[PDB]
Amino acid sequence: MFYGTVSSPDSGVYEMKIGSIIFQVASGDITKEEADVIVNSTSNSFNLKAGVSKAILECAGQNVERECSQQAQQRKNDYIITGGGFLRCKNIIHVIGGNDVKSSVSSVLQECEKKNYSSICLPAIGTGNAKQHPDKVAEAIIDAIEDFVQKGSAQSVKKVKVVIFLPQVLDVFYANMKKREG
Numbered sequence: 001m002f003y004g005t006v007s008s009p010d011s012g013v014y015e016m017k018i019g020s021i022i023f024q025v026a027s028g029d030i031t032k033e034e035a036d037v038i039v040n041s042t043s044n045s046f047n048l049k050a051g052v053s054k055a056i057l058e059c060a061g062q063n064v065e066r067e068c069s070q071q072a073q074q075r076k077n078d079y080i081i082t083g084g085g086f087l088r089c090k091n092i093i094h095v096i097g098g099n100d101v102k103s104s105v106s107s108v109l110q111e112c113e114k115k116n117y118s119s120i121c122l123p124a125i126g127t128g129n130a131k132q133h134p135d136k137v138a139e140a141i142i143d144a145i146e147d148f149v150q151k152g153s154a155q156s157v158k159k160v161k162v163v164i165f166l167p168q169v170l171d172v173f174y175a176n177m178k179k180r181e182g
């Protein structure tokens with residue numbers, strides 16, 4: 001009921017429509033991306049600096065690092081929202097890599113609608129040190145978007161890009177997209 005056709009606008013990039021949203025997966029370094037929100041995949045303390053969280057915090061800068069620690073105090077947070085620092089985004093949403101990926105992506109999508117944001121970039125949450133299986137992660141990310149669209153919640157959000165660090169993970173996402181295509 002929602003899926004378009006998988007196509008490729010550049011080598012190593014694949015996209016398909018999911019309702020009104022363009023869902024893209026691409027190879028690369030997320031810190032090179034521009035989007036309204038960039039998603040960080042971190043630990044329960046929000047001060048992880050290994051893997052994608054290291055790339056993100058080192059590029060975002062020390063003010064963002066301070067923001068994370070401060071917010072982590074305030075509450076028993078499931079995710080936190082900070083400024084983008086020196087990343088090319090309006091906000092970073094920091095989710096926990098070990099947490100349910102579908103829930104995490106749903107939260108991200110909701111927060112983006114709240115801010116009338118149109119673009120999101122995220123990594124393959126949980127597929128590194130968290131050791132969540134890439135196919136389960138892919139399934140969860142795409143499921144979250146499909147559910148969002150089904151519920152009629154997608155109004156401002158128009159583009160969701162997963163930036164993926166290795167071929168092995170890219171191929172899994174592509175397979176999961178291809179399985180769903182109309």
Ligand SMILES: Nc1ncnc2c1ncn2[C@@H]1O[C@H](COP(=O)(O)OP(=O)(O)OC[C@H]2O[C@H](O)[C@H](O)[C@@H]2O)[C@@H](O)[C@H]1O
Binds near residue numbers: 044
């Ligand atoms: N610059 C980058 N851009 C995009 N993706 C990247 C980059 N660098 C790495 N990746 C990919 O980012 C993906 C995620 O790898 P990880 O950064 O380990 O995060 P997690 O979510 O698995 O674990 C985070 C915490 O969650 C749990 O508590 C765990 O115990 C951790 O403490 C991999 O595919 C990387 O190749």
